[PDB]
């Protein structure tokens, strides 16, 4: 018997989200193409692209072929395109997801969670619209702190109760999640008044700010709890392609037999943050709610920027894409080694840290102080150094934090050495 | 005494919108630049742009200088940028708004509505976030039908009561608005339980689908009603730069002594729809709520696409921008003349229409039929022609509509002649 549980997606969709109806720009593109080519439509609502002033583009690529938009491709790049993304980018990304994650839901019926993808204007846009789709005021949601400050700022106005799940150097601790969920009975998920959690959100690789990643065994245990208590998992994975380990841990999407995982991927850290391109992968009924919200907001991701990325990826193939990933990992892993060496030299005895598993941040706990912000934004700024106090990564940002987040994306080894010399002095003269 | 009334912006901001707090990507950009240049920050959260694969760009321009992104500019184009837009585009657009509209609010205190601008990922994103900022379920809002289908689809899930204001060939009819508002007393606006309308929304030039535009005298009367009953005006003006008249009618923004107008502009019809660039202009406290929502969603408009537009506009200057506008008007006005000639020839006696004042649509009322959709999507599609039934432009899209929207953005005169021959035959053989 094929594995996986029946889902009722209506439990995870607000009344406003369910009320949305389709609003594409001129759906006649289907009735015209299949019909006669001599079919004259005065029914469309597209501006004439011959008026647009940019005419051709040439974009050079390191380790890839030059990208050229000739006259006709430029007119396409400068015109509206489908809400979920251009078809050639969607098709390539779907094949990538199948290669990397082989999701169980690929061939499910739509109504029981068939895998669907949506290109978004950055991954964070997809996450925001997912949160907005699900959360009514008073709903309970689960996540591990410290968390990305932007996620916390997105959730705050929605009025949900954020329930912290304990975490350590291997991510969320399943025993903590199990203990929290024992507040409910599993059947309470079928009774709205009981207010069982709607979802668990986590960054499973290279959490910002901690650098920690989940293990495979913990992901399996967490997934089983999500099935038992019938909550969704929001897998926000922007550092998926920045793991230092040779082998990537299987994702929640890869084990999602039920159709309860919404995954966010991004090329923001590896290909371009400024182009505003990410993508959601998840069950069709939930992805459809996000698409409909896009249709009345941004309409679509930039057609031009999608064509840039799509042409890059098609020429690279999976091989060239993974080779690029491996160059970027190599660079960040060397930066990681450099910042750890500077910490070993100058901060030993004064602070403690875990080795980042992925991403671009080192999370430093200063010993013998209750709050860092004293010796950073008032003392380190006078000595020529700035690192980020940890307070902003908690729901309660006023509580004291002895943590600093240090970035290793760009500093040279010399800059890291100086920076940690200064920090060591500050810690010393503050004890 | 300087003209304009005290505003209380809290009356137009939902609890969720007011709850938002600032969430920029690493605000340390200010403490670093003014500080010493030898200040080492490990506090930022930017990915290293040297990893990104695109290295230079060359973009040709008709009637303008070729745009070049060299190595350093490309790294900027591929990186995160500020939520409200890049500074050089904001500054140029602010000067444009001052030139075109000379808004009264330029030098007001922030708290009483100082003019502020936000570049958005298309104008519709700004409008969506404005609607979301204002509307609680059950709130009353005012607009004229027929209206852009996307606006209606955006408002539907928010649960507002849409109150139709009568409109004719000169836009909203002020006597209708006055009669509707007589349901309330002006002081009811200071009593939430009375549920006075929160805003009036309109497309004042070249309404989609009608082609009609407001007159100056009506705008003044409408503005006075907005002051008297204390509602905002949402001026959605994507065809502002596509007016066929030599002189543009003054905008609501140009008369906004109170700070009660939120204006949406777009370059989607004139420079590029696919680049997803528009902008809001409005009172600082309201624009700030939109920016904060952007900060947790799209983060910013594509940096690359903003640099393309900004470099185009700076090289053109106001003179080159207006010259481009005038070429585009010339083209669309000729298309307008062509579709009117085809209507004169083939549809006279069978339909009636008003001459479009702006934009790219002709709105045709078929005589002697209650609903068109019979003779379009089941009869015209077999004869090689498609035009858009008017039903989608009303809140009640199931009510019969004898109207068709015909686009003149692209068809040749020959295609228009054929299309209207067919439509004339269909009307004839359906009576």
From Swiss-Prot, chains A, B:
Catalytic activity entry: glycine + 2-oxoglutarate = glyoxylate + L-glutamate; L-kynurenine + 2-oxoglutarate = kynurenate + L-glutamate + H2O; L-kynurenine + glyoxylate = kynurenate + glycine + H2O; 3-hydroxy-L-kynurenine + glyoxylate = xanthurenate + glycine + H2O
Q: What is its EC number?
A: 2.6.1.39, 2.6.1.4, 2.6.1.63, 2.6.1.7
Residues modified to N6-acetyllysine? 75, 185, 269, 345, 373, 428
Any keyword Acetylation? yes
* Interval spanned by the transit peptide: 7-35
Chief subcellular location: mitochondrion
**Which sequence ranges are marked TM in the entry?**
none
Cellular compartment(s): Mitochondrion
Q: How does activity depend on pH?
A: Optimum pH is 7-9.
Q: Name one GO cellular component term.
A: mitochondrial matrix
Q: Which GO terms describe its molecular function?
A: 2-aminoadipate transaminase activity; glycine:2-oxoglutarate aminotransferase activity; kynurenine-glyoxylate transaminase activity; kynurenine-oxoglutarate transaminase activity; methionine-glyoxylate transaminase activity; protein homodimerization activity; pyridoxal phosphate binding
The record's annotation in InterPro entries points to: Aminotransferase_I/II_large, Class-I_PLP-dep_aminotransf, PyrdxlP-dep_Trfase, PyrdxlP-dep_Trfase_major
Cofactors needed by this protein, per the record, are: pyridoxal 5'-phosphate
Task: List the biased-composition ranges (Polar residues).
Answer: 204-214
Q: Quote the record's activity regulation.
A: Kynurenine transaminase activity is competitively inhibited by aminoadipate, asparagine, glutamate, histidine, cysteine, lysine, 3-hydroxy-kynurenine and phenylalanine.
Biological pathway: Amino-acid degradation; L-lysine degradation via saccharopine pathway; glutaryl-CoA from L-lysine: step 4/6
Tell me which UniProt keywords the record has, alphabetically. Acetylation, Aminotransferase, Mitochondrion, Pyridoxal phosphate, Transferase, Transit peptide
Record note on temperature dependence:
Optimum temperature is 50 degrees Celsius.
Family the entry assigns: Belongs to the class-I pyridoxal-phosphate-dependent aminotransferase family.
According to its UniProt entry, the function of this protein is described as: Transaminase with broad substrate specificity. Has transaminase activity towards aminoadipate, kynurenine, methionine and glutamate. Shows activity also towards tryptophan, aspartate and hydroxykynurenine. Accepts a variety of oxo-acids as amino-group acceptors, with a preference for 2-oxoglutarate, 2-oxocaproic acid, phenylpyruvate and alpha-oxo-gamma-methiol butyric acid. Can also use glyoxylate as amino-group acceptor (in vitro).
Q: How does it assemble?
A: Homodimer.
Name of the protein in question: Kynurenine/alpha-aminoadipate aminotransferase, mitochondrial
């Amino acid at each position: 018997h094929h594995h996986h549980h029946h889902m009722n997606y209506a439990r995870f969709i607000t009344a406003a989200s369910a009320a949305r109806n389709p609003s594409p720009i001129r759906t006649m593109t289907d009735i015209l193409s299949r019909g006669p080519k001599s079919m004259i439509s005065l029914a469309g609502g597209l501006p004439n692209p011959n008026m647009f002033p940019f005419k051709t583009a040439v974009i050079t690529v390191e380790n890839g072929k030059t990208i050229q938009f000739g006259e006709e491709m430029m007119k396409r790049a400068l015109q509206y395109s489908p809400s979920a993304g251009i078809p050639e980018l969607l098709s390539w990304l779907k094949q990538l997801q199948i290669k990397l994650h082989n999701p169980p839901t690929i061939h499910y019926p739509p109504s029981q969670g068939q895998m669907d993808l949506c290109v978004t204007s950055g991954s964070q846009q997809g996450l925001c619209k997912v949160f907005e789709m699900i959360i009514n005021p008073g709903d309970n949601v689960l996540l591990d702190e410290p968390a990305y400050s932007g996620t916390l700022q997105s959730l705050h106005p929605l009025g949900c109760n954020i329930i912290n799940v304990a975490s350590d150097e291997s991510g969320i601790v399943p025993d903590s999640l199990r203990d929290i969920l024992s507040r409910w009975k599993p059947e309470d998920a079928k009774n709205p008044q009981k207010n069982t959690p709607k979802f668990l959100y986590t960054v499973p690789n290279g959490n910002n700010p901690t650098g920690n990643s989940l293990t495979s065994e913990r992901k399996k245990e967490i997934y089983e709890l999500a099935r038992k208590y019938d909550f969704l998992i929001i897998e926000d994975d922007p550092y998926y392609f920045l793991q230092f380990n040779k082998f990537r841990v299987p994702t929640f999407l890869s084990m999602d037999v039920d159709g309860r995982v919404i995954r966010a991927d991004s090329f923001s850290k590896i290909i371009s943050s400024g182009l505003r391109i990410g993508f959601l992968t998840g069950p069709k009924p939930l992805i459809e709610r996000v698409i409909l919200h896009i249709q009345v907001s941004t309409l679509h991701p930039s057609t031009f920027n999608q064509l840039m990325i799509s042409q890059l990826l098609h020429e690279w193939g999976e091989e060239g894409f993974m080779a690029h990933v491996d160059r970027v990992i190599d660079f960040y892993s060397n930066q990681k080694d450099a910042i750890l060496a500077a910490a070993d030299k100058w901060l030993t005895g004064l602070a403690e840290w875990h080795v980042p598993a992925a991403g671009m941040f080192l999370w430093i706990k200063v010993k013998g102080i209750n709050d860092v912000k004293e010796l950073i934004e008032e003392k380190a700024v006078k000595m020529g150094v700035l690192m980020l106090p940890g307070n902003a990564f908690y729901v309660d940002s006023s509580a004291p934090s002895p943590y600093l987040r240090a970035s290793f994306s760009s500093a040279s080894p010399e800059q890291m050495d100086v920076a940690f010399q200064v920090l060591a002095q500050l810690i010393k003269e503050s004890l």
